[PDB]
Ligand binder design. Structure first.
Ligand SMILES: *[C@@H]1O[C@H](CO)[C@@H](O)[C@H](O)[C@H]1NC(C)=O
Ligand SMILES: *[C@@H]1O[C@H](CO)[C@@H](O)[C@H](O)[C@H]1NC(C)=O
Ligand SMILES: *[C@@H]1O[C@H](CO)[C@@H](O)[C@H](O)[C@H]1NC(C)=O
Ligand SMILES: *[C@@H]1O[C@H](CO)[C@@H](O)[C@H](O)[C@H]1NC(C)=O
Ligand SMILES: *[C@H]1O[C@H](CO)[C@@H](O)[C@H](O)[C@H]1NC(C)=O
Ligand SMILES: *[C@H]1O[C@H](CO)[C@@H](O)[C@H](O)[C@H]1NC(C)=O
Ligand SMILES: *[C@H]1O[C@H](CO)[C@@H](O)[C@H](O)[C@H]1NC(C)=O
Ligand SMILES: *[C@H]1O[C@H](CO)[C@@H](O)[C@H](O)[C@H]1NC(C)=O
Lengths: 110, 593, 593, 110
């Protein structure tokens, strides 16, 4: 069968640290979308903070909200696909500011 | 491209680099106090690199003409960044002023008075401060007072004279009137619709806010002198000023300290929970945690984990660091407190005061780097002190379970507490006003070198009601014996601090829907207030401070009455005692014939 | 026959009849206090018969023109006798003045303040005096003070107004300026070679002897206020005068009393031998006998047996008589003291003071009847008080065996005692000066009826440094609440008394060959002095007082310095304390807003 | 034989009491002189104060000094006789003032 790390690796500290993460690569097993070809699979959300040097990281949280569609944790995708499922990815410093850094778009067929 | 738009991305790339480097200077300073071996002397390097950086970026923001700047936010940063500052000085004169500031900072930092015991010396820390705090021997306290103002005072004189020269020349070049005019600049604001403040409208609003605060002071002053006479018989005349070295600390900046003497109803159970804590095995950690907890209740965030994990709040004493309670906003979402905590009611309130600082810091850390700061000097100081008040009330102590509800809260404990507060608070106001009324006059070039001390004490007796215990000729330089003078800080902030401090607590308790005397208020539990407060905190130095006030209070300018009305019950009680006492003083009396 | 020679035998026959009748009036007064049933009311008759006699003999000495009188002694008697006096008044006005004096004497004699307890009253004796002496409750003392000055004060007003009218009319008719001018007449002397004294030269020699005594007083005054504040906190302002009812007696005539409060070195063994006596089983008789014994040693007589045999010195209390300590020179070699003696150091000194009076009486009892008196008012009072001094010294107490020589006599006990003395003595001087400075101004017709009280207290505050504790309108008449005012005595005598009192002790100690401070002196054993003294005593009112002084001292007129030099060690010690206290006072302060 | 009260009876208080007694009768058995006719006799000096009313009397002392002749206590006499013997009589109030109020004159023969 086919397992799926859905990774959001993040860095911190542009013109303002705290405002938004610096950069954030969103990835479905390294590449940008993955269509399942072997019925039953496994999907997980990994969140990866790149060492910045300050204990400011670790107060930086990126998690994914619920959103467009029924289930909460068939193809997956970074980037927009007609008839998707936006589990949108929200990034926050210490629950002060929120900023949505992307989404996981899903597409069913039943 | 719109030079605004061209400055927009110039500032973007500035903020980035600046946040990196300022995290470097701050992390190295923390490390100076915090940690082992290899940390003692990197602070001083990475600070000069910060200095080098900041200097370049000014020489390069001069290329962004403010006039064409529409965005009010970028204008401010640009304005802030592009200040020629100290660099605008003959290379040698720039060094010589540096040379001076370090020397003055160090002499004060490392000045000691000795005894035919030239090996035995006490310093300002413990040494003397511990004497001026406890000792009740006039001659001993006078010896402490005089020895300090002589050994580390006369040293500072020639340096301080030179210091005003270049320090002015720097302001005169920066098209300020004098170095005094320069510091007032902090409260200035231009080109904002009916929100402006003139550089010299501060003096008036201090002077004219002072005449109003003068009556309350005199009754407090004439009250203390009477209770002082009783502790030091023979020594205190009831027509004349108080002898400086009797005011509970080296300078008499606060009277908080020597209070056990001026206590009104000493019969009462003492409102120091200091030992109540010990009895519940409270550690330095249980204080801050109960202080974080305070804030949480008012609609604000719990401390960043990591603030916890490398903040130093206990004292290693095994390592040695500077224990003066501080709150540190290094870059990069990094906040921590350095404080050598003891299980105390005092160190408890200090926790609230320092964490207040951290909360202000966290609030505005989203504002572009350059504007991450108190709206003006002494906004920050006030936002810390406003916390003590709510956290030092019976209502608070009672609920927090550090004082049983059994506690009888009559009009007696009222003054008992309200007095101690005034010793600390109403105490310092006139001290503070004169200290700067002096430097202002010096930096203007009103007082010459041959009268500096004569005009100082003339003013101490005149405004503050305090006399030197010994004649000082001009070889002395007493204002220089205070920290904020020799370490080159504007001091008038401690005054403005206190005025706002109350305006806040007034409007903030208004939001908490409070009822009785303003001093009983305890905004905890009250999210309604915390938001009013945050609404200004998060702003940083982003809108002018005049507006920032109006958010929390209702006035574009400071006001005196919130303070007076807080002390109303004490004021109408002190008149009661000064019905017969002599209220006020004569410049003309001196303890030395 | 030489009208001198014709007056010589006129005076012989007068002195015979007068000594008979004056023994009768004196024996009947003694009997008023002394003894049973049938003695209560004969005093009043036999006095009016004395009055009848004296009046006839004036109307008959008018026939002896003074101008033709060579013998200086007969001139004086004749002068004395031939005074129209009070008789020189419209019959009804003579009665009406009598009617007034009795009423005033009685209201004061029988005036009582009461409580919703209209039955319960205290009088001046015990009652109030015992309160003003002990009580430390401001409000209570004020109530005693005010109730007396109201109940027996307002009664005295309309009578006292009328009393000055006729009392002046009597002087104005006797060719004196005013009744005030009349009293001063006592210190007058005409037609004796460079020995004269003008009737108004007294005021000047009081006023000009007062400016000299003013500095010592203020330092004593500013000293007590300080120690008083400590006993009555809240109540005493250190710019302003002392509140009358705090001065240890109903008027504040002496401060002797409330001293335990103003004591300097309370640490010291107390110099009250009061209980030392009790421990040696001393009765009222052992006091006077030891006082007789005092005099014997100074070259004077032991008491007449018969003085012993019908002098009352113990108090019957089983019979009731007036215990105010008095010395009685009835006619006919007959001397006795009436005194309700208690075993005390105070009642011990009083013995000496009263027997001193007897010794003066015995000394001059050879002078023709009319001249048997103190040289002037307050010579007599002085001659008694000069004995207390010698008898209240450690040197005396020590030797007399009432205090063991073991007694350490350092500079500490010095002020300890010298203060008490000044409380009593320096205490009363200004009180006294004002009291008469007031009547003088009244009797002249300077103060009108509608300012009497206002001008009185103005002067109390001004000269004496004492404030009324309540406002008094003109329904009041406070000077009248004092004995000597309502019972119609010149009061200035208590002043002059004190001045002489020391001039004597000075010259008398000089004779005793004394060495140290004037206050350690104890003329006993020293016949050398006693004779200097007697040489003036025996003279009576026979030569002018100005000469009588010169016999003992060396000056024709009073002097202030002897007194001041007696208090020198206290004076230079009080400045020591008032180095910082406020020395002096302001008329403008009052304890009632 | 013949006994002899020599009496000096005195009153007190003229223009001045204390100065001198008022009056004083001196007497040899009532009359003014007495000549002894029966060898052996007895002679005594009696002093008699007349009640005056004040304890001033009793401080009045009349005694006789010694004087002119050998013995101290033949004819006796109030009044002067050639070749007498003046035991003079001295009267004093409380030993303050002295005043001689008379004498007893004696005349011997051997
Ligand atoms: C200033 O620039 C920032 C860029 O996002 C913007 O949020 C702000 O609204 C601008 N202000 C004005 C007045 O244009
Ligand atoms: C607020 O504080 C009181 C006592 O101070 C406590 O009993 C109450 O539960 C608190 N509630 C909240 C929500 O913070
Ligand atoms: C006055 O009269 C008395 C009578 O004895 C006498 O002692 C005194 O010397 C007389 N004085 C003069 C001056 O004549
Ligand atoms: C005088 O007094 C001393 C003690 O005071 C005593 O010992 C001495 O004997 C006295 N002498 C006479 C003659 O009075
Ligand atoms: C995620 O899965 C990959 C295989 O797809 C595996 O090699 C890797 O160790 C996993 N990483 C984590 C953090 O679980
Ligand atoms: C997609 O490409 C990169 C190779 O550079 C790799 O990191 C990632 O694992 C690839 N994914 C898969 C599913 O092979
Ligand atoms: C004196 O003597 C006479 C007789 O000569 C006698 O009667 C009388 O009692 C005596 N008087 C006194 C006082 O002794
Ligand atoms: C002398 O005369 C009178 C008689 O009146 C009498 O008192 C006295 O005793 C007579 N003397 C003698 C000795 O008879």
């Amino acid at each position: 069968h086919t397992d799926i790390n859905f990774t959001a690796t993040a860095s911190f500290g542009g013109s303002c640290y705290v405002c938004k993460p610096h950069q954030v690569n969103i990835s479905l097993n390294g590449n940008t979308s993955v269509c399942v070809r072997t019925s039953h699979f496994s999907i997980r959300y990994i969140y990866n903070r790149v060492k910045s040097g300050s204990p400011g990281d670790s107060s930086w949280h990126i998690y994914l909200k619920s959103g467009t569609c029924p289930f909460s944790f068939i193809c997956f995708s970074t980037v927009e696909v007609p008839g998707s499922c936006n589990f949108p990815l929200e990034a926050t410093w210490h629950y002060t500011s929120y900023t949505i850094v992307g989404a996981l778009y899903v597409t069913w067929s039943e | 491209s719109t030079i605004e738009e061209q400055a927009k991305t110039f500032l973007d790339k500035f903020n980035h680099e600046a946040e990196d480097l300022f995290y470097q200077s701050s992390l190295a300073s923390w490390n100076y106090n915090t940690n082992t071996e290899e940390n003692v002397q990197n602070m001083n390097n990475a600070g000069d690199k910060w200095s080098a950086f900041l200097k370049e970026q000014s020489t390069l923001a001069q290329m962004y003409p403010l006039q064409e700047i529409q965005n009010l936010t970028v204008k401010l940063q640009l304005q802030a960044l592009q200040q020629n500052g100290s660099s605008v000085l003959s290379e040698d004169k720039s060094k010589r002023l540096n040379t001076i500031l370090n020397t003055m900072s160090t002499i004060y930092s490392t000045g000691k008075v000795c005894n035919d015991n030239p090996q035995e010396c006490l310093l300002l820390e413990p040494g003397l401060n511990e004497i001026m705090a406890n000792s009740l021997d006039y001659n001993e306290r006078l010896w402490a007072w005089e020895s300090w103002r002589s050994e580390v005072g006369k040293q500072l004189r020639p340096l301080y004279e030179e210091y005003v020269v270049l320090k002015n020349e720097m302001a005169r070049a920066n098209h300020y009137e004098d170095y005094g005019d320069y510091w007032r600049g902090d409260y200035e604001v231009n080109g904002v619709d009916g929100y402006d403040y003139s550089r010299g409208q501060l003096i008036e609003d201090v002077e004219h806010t002072f005449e109003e605060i003068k009556p309350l002071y005199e009754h407090l002053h004439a009250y203390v002198r009477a209770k002082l006479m009783n502790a030091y018989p023979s020594y205190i005349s009831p027509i004349g000023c108080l002898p400086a070295h009797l005011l509970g600390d080296m300078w008499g900046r606060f009277w908080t300290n020597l209070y056990s003497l001026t206590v009104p109803f000493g019969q009462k159970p003492n409102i120091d929970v200091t030992d109540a804590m010990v009895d519940q095995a409270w550690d330095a950690q249980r204080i801050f945690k109960e202080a974080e907890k305070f804030f949480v209740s008012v609609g604000l965030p719990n401390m960043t984990q990591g603030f916890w994990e490398n903040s130093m709040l206990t004292d290693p004493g095994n390592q040695k660091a500077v224990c003066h309670p501080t709150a540190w906003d290094l870059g990069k979402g990094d906040f921590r407190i350095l404080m050598c905590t003891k299980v105390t009611m005092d160190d408890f309130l200090t926790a609230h005061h320092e964490m207040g600082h951290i909360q202000y810091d966290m609030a505005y850390a989203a504002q572009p780097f350059l504007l991450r700061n108190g709206a003006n000097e002494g906004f920050h100081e006030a936002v810390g002190e406003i916390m003590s008040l709510s956290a030092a009330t019976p209502k608070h102590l009672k609920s927090i379970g550090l004082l049983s509800p059994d506690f009888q809260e009559d009009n007696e404990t009222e003054i008992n507490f309200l007095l101690k507060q005034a010793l600390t608070i109403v105490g310092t106001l006139p001290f503070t006003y004169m200290l700067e009324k002096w430097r202002w006059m010096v930096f203007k070039g009103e007082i010459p070198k041959d009268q500096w001390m004569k005009k100082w004490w003339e003013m101490k007796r005149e405004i503050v009601g305090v006399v030197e215990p010994v004649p000082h000729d001009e070889t002395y330089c007493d204002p220089a014996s205070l920290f904020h003078v020799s370490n080159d800080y504007s001091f008038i902030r401690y005054y403005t601090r206190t005025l706002y401090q109350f305006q806040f607590q007034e409007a903030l308790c208004q939001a908490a829907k409070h009822e009785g005397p303003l001093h009983k208020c305890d905004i905890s539990n009250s999210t309604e207030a915390g938001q009013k407060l945050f609404n200004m905190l998060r702003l940083g130095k982003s809108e002018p401070w005049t507006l920032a006030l109006e958010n929390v209070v209702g006035a574009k300018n400071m006001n005196v009455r919130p303070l007076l009305n807080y002390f109303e019950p004490l004021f109408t009680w002190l008149k009661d005692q000064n019905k017969n006492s002599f209220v006020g003083w004569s410049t003309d009396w001196s303890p030395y014939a």
